[PDB]
């Protein structure tokens, strides 16, 4: 999160820190959020050989009672995900065990198929990514305000599509998401409306987020049969 602020400790109990072993066998990390006791939502480009889920944390370097580290039982990257174009970048992770909805851990309601967000609205991105281009991933959970822009502000991204994606972040500001924030939710009025997908290497906004409402039917099917 760039230009953000540190979140209040355990104020967003649905946030998940993901440690990934990529298919290329590289060690990586992403953000994510719990939408049901045994299902975490995140970005498809965070898929891999194995994945661990850490819930109930604020500072990933400080172990606390609220900590709940769960293994991922099954990965559900969107069937139409395209790594080259980075399209349909959304994934559902079924946990080996159900998380305990006690203190520090809770779920996050997601947007309805026809309850999406209109340009102009100010939402909040939340993740564990880098606080800047050459800065390290933040130990503490961060959050920053970002405005939804008209799809035209993202025409410089040759593979962008307003239907399944969102154009977020006033280009005149530094506020934005970056490496490590993928899978994190974009909230507007306490509801997850998007998922951080990709950004510009120099961190200049806006950025692209997966529009959750567009995949509501697919998400429901997974949660229905699992």
């Amino acid at each position: 999160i760039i230009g953000g602020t540190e979140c209040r400790p355990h104020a967003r109990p649905y946030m998940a820190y993901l440690e990934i072993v990529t298919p290329e066998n590289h060690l990586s990390a992403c953000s994510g959020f719990l939408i049901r006791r045994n299902f975490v939502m995140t970005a498809a480009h965070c898929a891999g050989r194995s994945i661990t889920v850490l819930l109930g944390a604020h500072n990933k370097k400080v172990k606390e009672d609220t900590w709940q580290k769960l293994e991922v039982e099954k990965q559900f990257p969107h069937p139409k995900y395209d790594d080259r174009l980075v399209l349909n970048d959304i994934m559902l992770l079924k946990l080996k065990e159900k998380a305990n909805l006690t203190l520090g851990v809770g779920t996050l309601p997601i947007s309805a198929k026809s309850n999406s967000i209109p340009p102009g609205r100010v939402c909040r991105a939340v993740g564990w990514g880098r606080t800047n281009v050459n800065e390290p991933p933040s130990d503490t959970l961060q959050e920053v305000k970002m405005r939804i822009l008209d799809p035209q502000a993202c025409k410089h991204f040759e593979d962008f599509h307003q239907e399944p994606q969102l154009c977020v972040g006033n280009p005149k500001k530094i506020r934005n998401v970056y490496k490590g924030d993928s899978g994190g939710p974009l909230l507007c009025a306490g509801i997850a409306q998007g998922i951080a997908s990709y950004v510009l290497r120099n961190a200049k906004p806006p950025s692209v987020f997966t529009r959750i409402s567009h995949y509501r039917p697919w998400i429901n099917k997974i949660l229905r049969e699992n």
Partner: peptide, 4 residues
């Protein structure tokens, strides 16, 4: 672009 770069996928985060």
């Amino acid at each position: 672009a770069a996928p985060a």
